[model samples]
Target: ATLKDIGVSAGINILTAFIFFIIFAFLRLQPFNDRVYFSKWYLRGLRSSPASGGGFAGRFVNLELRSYLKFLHWMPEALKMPERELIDHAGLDSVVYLRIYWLGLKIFAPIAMLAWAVLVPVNFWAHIIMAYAFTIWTCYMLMKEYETVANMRLQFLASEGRRPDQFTVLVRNVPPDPDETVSELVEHFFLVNHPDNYLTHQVVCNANKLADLVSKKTKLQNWLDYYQLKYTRNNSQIRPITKLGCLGLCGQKVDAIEHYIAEVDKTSKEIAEERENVVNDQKSVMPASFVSFKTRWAAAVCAQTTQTRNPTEWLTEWAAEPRDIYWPNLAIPYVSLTVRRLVMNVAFFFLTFFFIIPIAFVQSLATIEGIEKQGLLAGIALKLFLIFLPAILMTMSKFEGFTSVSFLERRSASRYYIFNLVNVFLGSVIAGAAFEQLNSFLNQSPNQIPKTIGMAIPMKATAFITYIMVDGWAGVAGEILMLKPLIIYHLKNAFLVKTEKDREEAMNPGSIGFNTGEPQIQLYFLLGLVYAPVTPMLLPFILVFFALAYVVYRHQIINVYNQEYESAAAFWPDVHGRVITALIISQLLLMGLLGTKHAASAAPFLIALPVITIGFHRFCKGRFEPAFVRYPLQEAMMKDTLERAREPNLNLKGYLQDAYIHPV
Candidate 1:
């Protein structure tokens, strides 16, 4: 499309997003919409009805005309909550995740200003200087932020009361002994090796069958409630009935309530029996245990140190919080886990580089002549297939058996970023199809690839400028409206709501989708850096995106988006690393672009930007990354000592005995 068309498209999208924001601003003030907009705080009991002291109209709608004049009031309200309060109210995860957007604004706003104000008005010599300045500035900012986040994490850990995981270590791959059972072996080994520290242990159980049964029972119970509600609402009508078979298709018919009661009773008995079996039967036990230590210090030592001569036989790590553990993954053998990771890694490599092969083949089959000759439905079907391919790849990655949702998401994010780097970023610059580009890159020298792509960077400026508007600017605005979630919630509410609890369930505001969201933001960072020198005009678009995104996401996190789980912002390092990667990629591209401009003298010096950036990243990882990953012995000891002093008679055994029990 032409630059004017792109501009028009962007203007339309931005207008739509602004309209959405205004509508949301007005909607959020009304009491009836409060729960929908600010569900997170409401769920936490940190907020309540704004119109609690009013009459019927006041309870449902905002009658105050003055509130409408200040449509942007919510922005300030979003930022008003102190970081510490945010950490406590939402979670450390939410606080840390939002900092990423803040990080973007902090890093880019100044750079964009510098580029446009100084570098754009000057000569090529100034370009070289500004590039170096941006690198140094970015490194300094990243180092400070990393330190700040690391300190926050440590402070959060220290200030928090004792948690079960703090005094527990997860020991997996316990060696099997013919003479003893898994439980006996675990108890004996820990007592022998850590007599002073080891207090108790709970062996992992194969509770997959029991978990499934419980899930089925819960679903059945929900259905029963729906039917009962239906009957209660219409007393003159006959009571609901269902067949005693699959989906009510077979067997004798019976009253729904009676059938559900009988089924529930049967399921309850089965659950009880299964629980007893899990406890008593040795066969249910796996070769893993949540081994509790007498104190946090002891647990930290155990988690950090080698337990046995054969490290593989007795693998130990700091245990995840009870809610954080992915129970099914505990059943996976260590060897199986390793093998799956290796296979997935190889598959991901192929998927990253060769994904376009199929796309090219499909496009070849459907040339313009062929597509024009075919009906519109055929073209639509082809487009749909193309759109679904990436989603299919994402599903494949999820199926690769990641133990934790966080880990799964990180994996998906990395894969997605790589896919975008190849297709979206490079595809926009290079003229040929992805496979053709791959073939050319493979045939060309290592130095030639960057040069080739760099030469095309300036030519693609208008396209990327439009891309930022449509993808970044418009996307962030659409997020506030949450049209998809709204539709889904209404659909579920209509068909599924039988109780207040059911309505709440239907209205569940989803968490920040890091997998999808983070990479897209990173793409803008990449774009901004790449075009910062080649075309300074792109910086404004990038700045607008970052600024707009910061406000939109800040508002969303405060009022919407209930977090699914907490990882204490374990994802921050990845964010830091990706930005650094973008920095390096931009540096190399700049070097190549400068080389093409006959500025070979500056090119050699420019090579050091990526090297120095990488070195700084490695240093940060070594210095601060461990703070996120492991708890120190000193911190653990301090907390443990304080806890013991605070509650001398605390029941550690009673507290931890059932903490790690199988969810089923």
Candidate 2:
């Protein structure tokens, strides 16, 4: 791509970004749009939709024109949320997630300053030295980040007040006993194993039907809201009406509010009935129980200790928090889970190839060296693929049936990483360089692979830079605008929303969407790390993207995302792992570049870079990963003693009783 092509691509995307932001400012000012724009506050119960009630003109159309002028003011509002509050309000998972962007800057800012700032040089035996320095510097920078976040996780876990998970242990795979129920076995099993501390236990029930029914009722609540909102908006003497057929289209004419109110009542009664049946019949109880302990120390011991010789018969783990548990997965049988996983993996393989076809077509479209028009096409092409891909992967992840929301997200992230690693990053390089070298990049012999791939790096920089702006700049702007949700909310308000509840339910501020956004950020990190030395100009754009995202997502998380659950930043290691792989790839690429340039000796000297990286990964695992997960007996014991001294009569049964119950 030439400078003008680059110029044109930037011009279009940057303007697109500006237009999105300008529209966001104007749209955000309107009060009627509050449900969509500021919906997280509603979900959190911090703000109500009706409290700002006033004149219709002012309510629907923002009367404060000055607010329009201050459209960019939200950035300042986002920055106002302090680190401690960010951690406190949303959990350290968010804090550390935002830190992913920070860590990117910390590592790359210094790398950029070093690689480009201090005037650089040469080839072969010479350029090999820069490779060594950059690789090592990147490694150590990551090591320090792991060190910081690890401590932060542990300190947060330690210092923060107690939650149910810390004192509870999950015991699955209860041995089959036709004579005794899973509950009876779990109680005796845990009581015998921990005679001193086993306090109580709650069986994991197959409340899937109840859970499903509860959400169905939840959606039905929207119907009542829709009817209520309609009657009020029209202020008609005649009551609002509807048919009670499929999706409320036809069956019998009924007063919408009257019928909906009674339907919710009946569903509520059925939910109550199911609740009693699940507990009393014991049939709904899965072969799992959350065992509570009298002390944190005891809980940690049981959570970590081996349960019995038959590993499959009795399994113990740190119980996910009630919110973290994706309840449906608990009901699936072990054998079924295995079969499902096998099926999903095969599906994923097929899914990836199916995805590759269209993208490969796009790659072919942009492969033209003549970049007169394809530049903009190349820029927007990746973004289009992004829209459906993340949703599909998330749906596929649900089919895989992971045990928690975080697990599903982390799973989706790795898959997305691999998908992009192959298609976006590698595909871009291969398509560009392969065409240029008469297929020599792909058609060549084994030894020539790296050399070809190494030189392929610089050619794709302009293209990736274009992708970054379109993908990152416009995307972040679009995220803050949330124009899609805004439009969707209005449609719901007009066509479906009937009451306050329906309006509230329809106003989804959305979740953090780890599956959706994390992979894209990861790709950027890969781009920056890869292009840092070869095409240092990309460094500034990388930093710009990072900084912009940091601001936008901080604002989004504080106001827009109503998180379903927190993993306490458990995904940190995954992010670190991706960056580690990027560093390793960059080193190998640099080595190849040097070797191709005639610095043959550089290969041997630089061979240790990846080894050291792998070693450092191991080092990080032992040194810091311990903090990333698992509850240690000593820390548990320490906290146990303190709590005992502080409150002699700590009534624990009440907290653990309802903690594991299904939402219904």
Candidate 3:
């Protein structure tokens, strides 16, 4: 409405960020905050957590004045680590994934000047030129990044110490046979198929019940440690007393340490009994197995081919990593996976765009702007939806039955990306409530598509610019301030904590949420590309976000996100493809703008940009995607050949025996 009003929004958001950085400065230094800012240090055993020998003032506070001098010093420390160490320290997945933010800074690099060149006496062509600027440079960078990732995946597979997955395949769907046991049949089957290469197989155990017992055993062990800590805190082996009742409310008083000690022994005995039952019982063993071969070449070949005529039986695929494997899902029935492919996907589309009657109608009320209450509800109506959106989508992905954690995250990320594209970006442009946008979008005039949206683009530019700080900038800073996690940490530590592992579980600083996080970053990409030609002022918002967001995440990645599952650049192709999709959308919007103007000279040239980029996108898929999906036969052979000659006669058979064991 006014520059004054814009400040109202910008000032509020900037204060959020400014205060977050302020709080982090104090929190980062305090000894008590060691459970947070330096969490990964204790989690990784890099530093001692109980080293508390200081004076009263220094007990939990940051007392060193010298430390305040370097309060802002994380700025350089973020980029100080060599990119080489980033790969080795964090894994290739983290290294390449970090490039999504870095790419924005590079593409949006100081190119805002010429648009500044245009804004004062601003030839709108200044935007057109910078729009032209999105091409050759970005494509060249894309191609360069694609090749770098391809060879890097190859090198990491080749140069590393061996993983069992390299010489193994996860074979499922072993049809029941009265003639031979599941193990004997698999060994007999693989024996003839690649008799020279086949070595051994470990049968999978259907141990969800067994696993439950083990998890319960850990819980009781922690309970014992809880009272043991109490005993240590008071006197030498003086047992703590407590009621053994429902929630410890009202039962006979007893020695708490002795009670927990009895329960631990009882659970331990039950766990052993279950373990013995699991080993000897036929029903406890699954139809699946990790079938290993003599060479990586043989394993790769076995993974890529079908073993039998009936496709559902004797299914084989490259083995998941020990940590990557979903243990309980190893023998999941095929029907649920089938249902997931159809039923779950259908729910995703409607849940993303449309809604149930009640929530939609409730939201339908907030759409009529101008009323104060309407405006008030507007903020959180969308806010609540966004909060729950990723979790809802993650549930859908879980039902879709992914075998690895990264697979689940990546699927959720793509779905979240589309939700951002439609509900946030398109809904913002159409300027309707989500459901109204759906109806009006469908029921509106054909010409309204190009003309309304084309002209509407700039009119809503100011609101989107405000949105950049409100959602984008403030949110990244909030990530650094993670008040939610800190409070949760306090609650867990005070109430639930028992031993080192309990502290470890309670102090778990989480990994990066690619499901929402990566998709949310793409919001700016769409905004930046579209806004480049239309409004130049937004470049600074974007560039600031890029710079600040990378620094914030870099610090967290270093200190907090001790990530699991080295996915080996699996996300790059998705990230790369989406950039080109945004680029395509930019060109289409450009075409719309020119069509509305009734006068653009190089208009035909702009048309070719999208087509050329589509072809470029197709090329990207063909060239680099192979590296992600296929482990090259020659590369696998090279690693296998080297290992055979160098580390000759390894006791691989017995070593692999314990690699994929069930919990109990």
Candidate 4:
């Protein structure tokens, strides 16, 4: 029965292809429209248009939810369409994914509710498994959709006889020259041979045959003349249909040959001049330390210092007899999350067991009654109190320094600065709440008070230290040690080379985006552990922090985007509203679940605080919105990329070259 069911399922999937085609045919004709609304020239004009009926309050009330419903209505059909139109305009591509995400809420939400009600006796692991599966499936679907769209785009680029912009190039078998003009020849050669831009598979096969025919007797010039003269006019389009004629006549094609020689001359002159002034002009412009740090690390990782050879040759060699060589695969991304957490745990354990006792003793002195009763217990408390105070102050100093360093290094942006501030400030609050809760727990157990309080004090103090370490010291360490190195490796593999001339080009600013490796996983784990034991006391404070962090991070992301792209564009309300709303709802849900059971508990006030704080912050941000709201930053980045494509530089040049060699 299971075998039959499996066969039936496979058949159904196959049959779905026909059903999908039928649905697509019907969908194409509907007034539902293929043209994305945002792509229309008139959409931007509507930003200035008057509200149909109301002023501020009336207009918002009428406009808000209705727009979202329109997105919801079209999403299913949009999902089924040919993937080309999806990602082209921001609306068609972005909105479909967002609407599907929203739809996920509708679909899984009911299933979750039904499962909880129907399976009252299930173990915790069972629930976890189900939830994990759903989450994984949702993520997979999202990725699969993107993959389909990407393949379609690739097909379009291939059909046009031009490689996609994302690809880099690698040239081989060309003669070296002193002239910089050779670079232009190199570019042209690549343009002509690139599968999309110049040569097709048929042309390559014929070129191979033509080479065989003249192998010993004829010079390259002779072959070029014969090919150009014969097929120069007929093979203009280089289509597959013209293949046979072009093969016989390629002996007459001289245009490409002549073009290559002219480019070589031009490039040689440019290279000479560039070499002459490199020390005086180029060296004067140093990248920011932050950018330099990332670049250096990238160079160390993936870049080879050897001479250029065809990548196909390497692949061919590897294929002939594969070896189980032990060379490290640095390309397998470096993530220090587990290591970061391990270090945090080991540090916390040591500090709590050995180093924190004295601090706890000093802290206890502040709460003691008087000098007369300063017996053994009081003396111990006083010592603990004194020790703990310096630790806190030292931690705070470290936190401040770490943040400053991160900014100076450009590992963290100006926006990240604000985020770090919020993270530290809230982290302190949670720490305080946890301490109070530990005290409460000790007080409740009369017999175990001495041992419990002794353990709790050190734990709290170590946690305080760990917070600063993971959030501040360890964070900066991870960025410096792990993140910086990974980023440098990527950059080097992407751009840098050991060649004398190419190395000079790699030093340019536009070539590097200043990407660096940072230990994100370790930081997350360290922070998670430090806060976990304190959950009962710290939950409320953590919730508040989470809300503030989300708002701040979102605002910072948008701010960075503003700096990176053009901004004279109209507001995309549908997307903005959905993301913002989701954030708010998630915060609210966390607050509700984690806050106190009693409605009158201090939890209620704590829960409401972040929302209020964010509301005011957003208002202030809004006052400056016009300055930061446009998409100019993204537009500029894209424009820069396109311009760089025609003429490659060492910095951006390496990435392009690598992409050409390795399509992915």
Candidate 5:
């Protein structure tokens, strides 16, 4: 074959071989069932979708692809060469990235196929249709896989039954009467104070301080005004501070004048007689109890308003009694494991990528001229057999766990597979479009056919936008709007259930109901639904960037999640989102500009850029609206406070005592 013909034929043959290899690899890898496949446990409580995989091969392929794509164990080794004991639990997020990778791969695969189809002389339209269909199929799989992973993660957290790191505490001091029931005090405290539970800081003294200062200042101002007016000339030289201080002295003198206001009765007995005798004989009144209560209340109010006073101390102090520390607890080990696992997991990711790069390199060479299509295919086939096959056999050769019926149900299985397929398909189409555009742009003689064909495909300016929208913006919005809240609320409820003393205690006024209420759940579901259609487009890019941005974002999410039990809200701080969004947008814009100049392949990705940018911007704004309103300084202040609090001997005693003295 001529050089051009050889290039064309070689590309076509290798591309075809790649497709067959993927499918074959998928099939060959089947047999070993992993927890991911059988753990459709998340679908049980929520909307019950039908199962998709069936029989031996279906189950095997499903399991293998799911596991392989996740790259669970591979990531750690990738990070630390010579392989060390990498913690697994800490790397709790491996599955998330794996899902992302799988989704990206699904997208990448079909697009690569589509590119080959387009580049070859076969009926361009037919190839496009097939490629599009396959892309859609893969895209569907990606969606399902994502849903599975997301729900699985949620369930894992939920099942573990952890509460948010922070909660509210309300306390009401009873009149020293011993007859008051604990339940009654708790009830009144909840009704009047409305403490949420496990609060990071009690607003107890701070709010109270503000109220007291504002009240005291108001009362002092009134007294000053009245005194100034009544005794204007005499008091002209007395400043406010001196005048206010003088009121105490004046009150002492006035005590005798109001002595008759005291009541003496048989209830007091000797105490009453002494007081009566003193008041009746001397004509003096003290009003000690009232004065004390007022002074305490005022102090509380003032403390609350002060800048340095912390509000969370009261709750923490109360909870920090000697019995609070659960020594010999497994939680400590688990937490340690989680940390180690995370470090190891991160290490593995780099390692896997390193190892895979050589393979990618070898594959890239398969693109060059003068290589036999059959020989190139053979080398790849051998590599797949040597590397991927062994991994698959080692991991997926056997099933070890029981799966629930809901997990394996035919309809549910179908939905899972279908979701993956469609996600892959959509991803492929977008990537394919990008690649084609880039190719055309790079080529001296741009492929006119691709440009014409791409134009004829009839996508709107918004469609590409919709695809781009799904990448990170939509993902962030959806996570905040739907996923985070659902997880948070359920987790809170689970905490209450797990920690409550009894059913009665669980039902107490101060206790929050486990159910965040149906309305809240519905709100979460609605958010997910709104963003569902666009998720496919959004997720792949998120995966790509996630891998790139993992280090910086990891610490952030860890802090947020540990403190708030999945506080995704912290992830999209305005600055971080803006930077990420800018990165994504700039990349898309460059791709679009290049494609517009070069090849037709770049058209779809180019067109999708603006739409994605706008969609993400709007979604991010809406998601953070609650934070801006309820806790404007929450992320910054909380992070700082938490970090400091976590240090050894932080001297929280003073703050703790203040919170204890005046609980919120």
Candidate 6:
């Protein structure tokens, strides 16, 4: 595309995003719209009804004319909350997640300014020197951020005090015993091996059926509520009636409230019976158990140590917090999980390398001559299809059944990075389909591939610069408007809300969608680094993206978005690692670009940058990653000692007896 086309596209996208922001700002002032726009704080009880003491007219709409004038006041309000308060109100995960954007701003804003003022004014060789300098500066910044976040995570864990997870170990893959039930076997084995520490155990139950029944009950209860509300509103001595089955379309006619009440009562009784049966029935129990310890030290030791001679059976690990548990995965066997991981790893490799095969085929078929014959609609169809490639890859990752949202996000980020690396980054430089690039690389020597791509780098700089503006700058602006969620919330509230509880459910502003979000931010980081020396103009757009994203997401976390689960910044290591990955990619690309600039003498030095950066990444992984993944014995012991002293009369057994029970 030409420069004129690029400018027009960028302007249109930015203008559209700004329009969305204006609309959101206006709607957010009205009380009727408050729940949709600012649901997070409401969910946390940090915010409440603005109309609590106001008149009827003021209850739904802002009657004061002055309130409408300050459209941008929410920006300062979003920032006014302190970091510690943010951690308390939203979560450490949300707080740390916001920092990724801030980190980009910190890393790139200054670099952009420096490159503009220094590197751009110098010779091409000077740009090469600046690239090396940028790499070192980036590594230093990343290391410091990683260390700071690591310390924060450790501190958060230490201050969190005693919890069930700290004193518990999850033991999976219990070997079957002919003489004993799973519970009895668990109790006997733990008593024999860890008699001093083993306090109690709770066997996991297959509650899938019970969960389904409970969900059905909830839907029925909502219907009951809706009918009750309607009956209350009407002065007529009439009651709501409905059919008994198939969404009230058929079967016996009945009073809606009476039918729901009977259903709920029956379901409640069944749920009670199921719970009892789950506790007693051997067939309902899975081999896994949450084995509580008398002290955190014991739990820590048991979690990190092998349990039985078979090695695979009686496997142990630190149990996740009750809320963090993905119960469906508890029954997965060690062998199955290992095989799944192996299969996923192989699939990911092929996905990364061969993903462009179909795209290439379509491109070949859609050549100028073919497109001229096929008509313009076919070309448009192909473009739309290309847009969905990343989404398809993301869907596959989600289907892989990762044990935590954090893990799923990390996996998704890795896949996204690969996709962008091949299609956006390399595809742009090589000026061909990704499959063609892959084919050319395989046919040529390794040295030829870099030189070929490096030769195209300067030529493609304008296109990349435009891409940064359209995708990053406009995208971040659009995020604050939350156009999609706004529409979805209104739809649910209008059609589905029955009572206050139903409204609350409808207003559930979802958590940070880290899987899709973080990788997109990482792309800007890649762009900032890759183009810092090659084309300093791109950095400004990246800086704008980071700044806008930081402000917008801060507002989002404080008011709009409700975090569904907390991992206490468990995803920070992945963020750090990905940033390092970007740095490595930038360094290699810069080295390639510099190779074509007749800076052969500096090639060896540039080559060492990635090696040094990789070493730093390894060191950080070893030093800080453990803080995220494991609970240290020392910290566990300290908390255990303190808890024991503080709660000398604590009913430890009763406290843990029902902690691990299924939700149903």
TM-score of each: 0.87, 0.85, 0.85, 0.25, 0.24, 0.84
Q: What tens-digit string does per-residue lDDT give for candidate 4 at 1-664?
A: 2435434543553344233333323322222111111112112232221122112233223332433333233334334533344223222223232333333333334434434443333412332233333333333433343334333333332232212221211122233345523334344433443323322100000122222323312222232333334445432321112345325324443335312343334545554544344323422211101001012112211112222354322010000000111111101111332344355445443432333455555555545634545244445543454334334323432333221221222322222222322233223433433334344544655423322332333235334433433333333222212223334434543432233432212111110111111112112222322232222222222222233222222221211111111111111222222223323332332333233222324334434544653563365345323222221233334433555565465354333232211101
Candidate number with the higher lDDT (4 or 6) = 6
lDDT tens readout by residue for model 2, 1-664 = 8878877977898788777777777666666676777777777777666234411344335644554445567878888989988887766887788888887788778877766754243314435556667777777877888888877877787875778888898887787798989989998988798989988998888888777778768766654455555656332122223343344433344544534566778888888888788767878889888899888888888877898998665677788878988777765656777788888787776655455566677777766643644144545345776767777777677777677889888888888887787667877887642234334545776557777778778777898888888889888989989878878978776766545434336677667777767888889888887877677767777887888898888987887777777677778888889988898888777766666765667688777888988998888888877766787777788888888888888888888878887764
The segments of candidate 2 whose C-alpha lies over 4 angstroms from its true place after superposition are: 42-69, 118-126, 220-277, 354-385, 432-446, 500-505, 597-599
Q: Highest lDDT among the candidates is held by which one?
A: 1
Deviating ranges (above 4 Å) for candidate 4: 1-93, 96-107, 118-125, 128-664
Q: Which stretches of candidate 3 lie over 4 Å from their true place?
A: 1-12, 50-70, 110-121, 124-132, 216-278, 333-336, 356-385, 444-451, 500-505, 599-604
lDDT of 5: 0.30
On TM-score, the leading prediction is: 1
> Higher-TM-score candidate among 1 and 2?
1
Show where candidate 5 strays beyond 4 Å: 1-91, 120-150, 164-193, 196-609, 616-664
Q: Rank by lDDT, highest first.
A: 1, 2, 6, 3, 5, 4
TM-score, candidate 1, is 0.87
TM-score of 4: 0.25
Model 3 RMSD in Å is 5.6
lDDT of 3 by residue, 383-496 (tens): 676788888888887788776678888989999888888877887888675667777757866645555576677778788888788777888888877677778877656644
What is the overall TM-score of model 6 with all chains considered together?
0.84
* Higher-scoring candidate on TM-score, 2 or 4: 2
Between candidates 1 and 5, name the one with more favorable TM-score.
Answer: 1
RMSD of 4: 27.2
Candidate 3 vs 6: which has more lDDT:
6
Better of 2 and 3 by lDDT: 2
- Candidate 1 residues 217-248, lDDT tens each? 77666654545566664222222334433354
Give the clashing residue pairs of candidate 6, or none.
Answer: none
RMSD of each: 4.9, 6.1, 5.6, 27.2, 28.5, 5.8
Span of ten consecutive residues with least summed lDDT in model 6: 51-60
Error of 6 at 157 (Å): 1.1
